[PDB]
Structures are given as C-alpha cells and as structure tokens.
Amino acid sequence: KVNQDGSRVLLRDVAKIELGGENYDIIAEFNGQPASGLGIKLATGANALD
Amino acid sequence: EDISDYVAANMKDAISRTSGVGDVQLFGSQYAMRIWMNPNELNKFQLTPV
Amino acid sequence: FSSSRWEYGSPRLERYNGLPSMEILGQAAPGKSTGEAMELMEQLASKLPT
Amino acid sequence: DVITAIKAQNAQVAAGQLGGTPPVKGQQLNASIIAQTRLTSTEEFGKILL
C-alpha cells in the first residue's frame, strides 16, 4: 500500500524473503555430512535389476 | 536446502519417469520463494497475511 | 499507466525431457553416411559452452 | 444469507502448528493447532448465527 503521506511499504519491509526449501520436515546426513538423495521405490511387478 | 533443490531441478525429474519407477522419495525439497511474514511489521502498516 | 516497448522473443520455444532444448535437423553427406555424420556432430557439440 | 452463513460457520479450516517445521533452535514441544471443526448434529446447525 501507499498510506496518505507518500510513504511506500514493500514485502521486503514487512517480511523476510529467502530462496529456501518448500518444506522443512525431512533432512538427511551421510556419515554426519549434510546431503540429499534419490530414494527410488520400484513399481508393482516391474523388472528390478533391469 | 541447496543440494535438495539441485537434486530435484536437475536429476529427480529424469527419474520417476525412466525405467519403470513407481515413485521417487526425494530426501529434501526443491527451492520455493519463501516469504517469512512479521506480525508486528504487518500490524505497523495495518496489514493482514491476506 | 502503461509503458510500451519493442523487445525480442521466441515464437516457438522447445523442451526435450523437461529441459529447454532446440532441434537441429541435418544430413549425412554425399560421401559419408550417418555413422560419421553423427560422430562429427557429437563432438562438434562437445566443443560448445558449459 | 442462509447458504453464506453455513460455509462460514460449518467448515474445517487448516491452521498450522506450534513449533512448525523451520523452528527456533531449542524448541521443546511440537503440537498441532485445531481451529474450526465440522458441525455434527441438528442442534449445532440450529445455533448458526445469521
């Protein structure tokens, strides 16, 4: 908004804006070292080793 | 936050669609524009999260 | 309330497997055929930017 | 006004939780927040304010 004064308010002024993960629930450590991973879950009656 | 985003926005999409994958559980989350509001700074300029 | 600007843009963007891609269409040669035509093109692309 | 009063009072809203997901370091309790729940009986519907 622009309140009767000429002053401007912005999302930067009202809120902390950062490029972060969409959820903060599940985190992983590989030997105590910060890391992610691709946990693959096979299809129903697929081909496994193929 | 940084690795989990890259693992999703460079690799994850190529899997889960490849050789008969049921579903992939990514160990983290891809980046999102996270806006962290402030109640007092909202109250200051007469603003609701709406 | 509106500014007016002429600006360059693509009329037909392309994506291969969820990644921005551009289709090159070519020929073998009056001498060579496919095998070398591809082999040439594969490292004519390897000597491109990162 | 009858209809409008129903979906405003007879509805289940999804509020967050105490000690959410990106928490303040040293948070001890993590409990879910319950707000408006869905009405169950003929009496509760009778008590809808217009």
Q: Where are the alpha helices (DSSP H) in chain C?
A: 35-44
The rounded distance, in Å, linking the Cα atoms of B48 and B39 is 8
**Which residues 6+ apart lie within 8 Å of D44 measured at CB?**
none
The rounded distance, in Å, linking the Cα atoms of B9 and B29 is 10
Cβ atoms of residues A28 and A35 within 8 Å = yes
The rounded distance, in Å, linking the Cα atoms of B39 and B45 is 10
Q: Where are the alpha helices (DSSP H) in chain B?
A: 2-6, 39-44
**Which residues 6+ apart lie within 8 Å of B41 measured at CB?**
A13, A14, A15
The residue of chain D nearest to residue A23, with distances taken between CA atoms, is D21
Looking at chain A, how many residues does it have? 50
Amino acid at D32: S
Q: Do A39 and B27 touch (CB under 8 A)?
A: yes
The rounded distance, in Å, linking the Cα atoms of A1 and D43 is 44
Which position has the token pair 């891609």? C21
- Chain A: closest CA distance from residue B18 (Å): 11
The rounded distance, in Å, linking the Cα atoms of A9 and A12 is 8
Q: Say if strands B21-26 and A38-42 run parallel, antiparallel, or are unpaired.
A: antiparallel
- Chain C: closest CA distance from residue B19 (Å): 14
Vertex B37 angle, CA B36 and B43, to 5°:
170
Q: How far is CA D19 from CA C6, D12, D26, in A?
A: 50, 21, 10
- Chains in contact with C, where contact means 3 or more Cβ–Cβ distances below 8 Å, are B
In a mutational test of the D interface, the residue from A18, A24, A26, A27 whose CB has the highest number of chain D CBs within 10 Å is: A24
Burial of B28 (0-12, 13-18, 19+ CB in 10 A): buried
- Can you say whether residue D9 is alpha, beta or left, with left for phi > 0 and alpha for psi between -120 and 50 degrees? alpha
Q: How far is CA D48 from CA D34, D38, D43, in A?
A: 20, 12, 9
The backbone torsions φ and ψ at residue B10, rounded to the nearest 5 degrees and listed phi first, read: -150, -30
3-state secondary structure of C15: strand
CB atoms within 10 A of CB B4: 25
The rounded distance, in Å, linking the Cα atoms of B27 and B23 is 13
Q: Say if strands A15-21 and B31-37 run parallel, antiparallel, or are unpaired.
A: antiparallel
The rounded distance, in Å, linking the Cα atoms of B37 and A12 is 10
Q: Residue A29 is encoded by which pair of tokens?
A: 């450590």
Technique of determination: X-ray
- Chain A: closest CA distance from residue D29 (Å): 15
Cβ atoms of residues A8 and A2 within 8 Å = yes
Amino acid at B25: Q
The backbone torsions φ and ψ at residue A27, rounded to the nearest 5 degrees and listed phi first, read: -125, 150
Q: Would you tell me which residues 11-50 of chain A have a C-beta closer than 8 angstroms to some C-beta of chain D?
A: 20, 23-25
